[PDB]
Design a protein around this ligand. Structure first.
Ligand SMILES: NC(=O)C1=CN([C@@H]2O[C@H](COP(=O)(O)OP(=O)(O)OC[C@H]3O[C@@H](n4cnc5c(N)ncnc54)[C@H](OP(=O)(O)O)[C@@H]3O)[C@@H](O)[C@H]2O)C=CC1
Ligand SMILES: *COc1cc(Cc2cnc(N)nc2N)cc(C#CCCCC(=O)O)c1OC
Length: 206
């Protein structure tokens, strides 16, 4: 037991695959963030009684999150890092790799545990995203496409939306996105801060 569940990656990126700047999001989209929270937090009502989703993130992304919103509530947080000095926390798990993170979660939350894991999300860090893209359990990408070539210093590691990856990565219908997300999601381009963006869901066969 260490690779039964599939991994889902969630990211906001420009048409040029840009995802970040000075260790932060180069855009202020309150609605986008609302989507991110909704998607990574959603659990089927029936399972909602004792099931929570997991959010795996890199150390940089973790530090980039305002203490006020740290850690991400209603979700089990796990920070992937190799440097362990005096990183404080409130029970926040710590793993040195994506697989080390999965073994930690499956061990901490077994069929005997009170809290059961529902979905596992990889929410951040180009580095962690790079490792997820290579993981055989990653089969889904919740992408928020930003139609603007905003200046970025960090980019998504793989052009999953490009022609070269079109036989591996396919974009699902909006009805399937909502069906998987469990809720109604805005369809079409959304305008916030003079920028057009929309939600998409991409999948690959494991
Ligand atoms: N547009 C979007 O949706 C998002 C954008 N971002 C942005 O991404 C940028 C930061 O990117 P990046 O620097 O890559 O961030 P990461 O959060 O991936 O930082 C990498 C750190 O995390 C650890 N790490 C990551 N992958 C691994 C691995 N496979 N094994 C071990 N440790 C690993 C290491 O920790 P240590 O050094 O402690 O060992 C490494 O230094 C910022 O602009 C940020 O805002 C972040 C999330 C979402
Ligand atoms: C430090 O930048 C950053 C990144 C994220 C991760 C994110 C955002 N959007 C999409 N589509 N995918 C990912 N992985 C999230 C935030 C934020 C926030 C705050 C509070 C929210 C909550 O979920 O409870 C972020 O901070 C500016």
């Amino acid at each position: 037991m260490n690779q039964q569940k599939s991994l889902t990656l969630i990211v906001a990126l420009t048409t040029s695959y840009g995802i970040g700047r000075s260790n932060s999001l180069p855009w202020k989209l309150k609605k986008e963030i609302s989507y991110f929270k909704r998607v990574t937090s959603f659990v089927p009502t029936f399972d909602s009684f004792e099931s929570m989703n997991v959010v795996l993130m890199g150390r940089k992304t973790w530090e980039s999150i305002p203490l006020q919103f740290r850690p991400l509530k209603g979700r089990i947080n796990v920070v992937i890092t190799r440097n362990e000095s005096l990183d404080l926390g409130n029970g926040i798990h710590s793993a040195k790799s994506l697989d080390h993170a999965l073994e930690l979660l499956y061990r901490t939350y077994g069929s005997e545990s009170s809290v059961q894991i529902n979905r596992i999300f990889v929410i951040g860090g180009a580095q962690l995203y790079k490792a997820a893209m290579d993981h055989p359990k990653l089969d889904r990408i919740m992408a928020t496409i930003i139609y603007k070539d905003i200046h970025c210093d960090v980019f998504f590691p793989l052009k999953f939306r490009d022609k070269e990856w079109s036989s591996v990565w396919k974009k699902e219908k909006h009805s399937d996105l909502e069906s998987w997300v469990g809720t109604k999601v805005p369809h079409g381009k959304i305008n916030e801060d003079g920028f057009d963006y929309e939600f998409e869901m991409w999948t690959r066969d494991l």
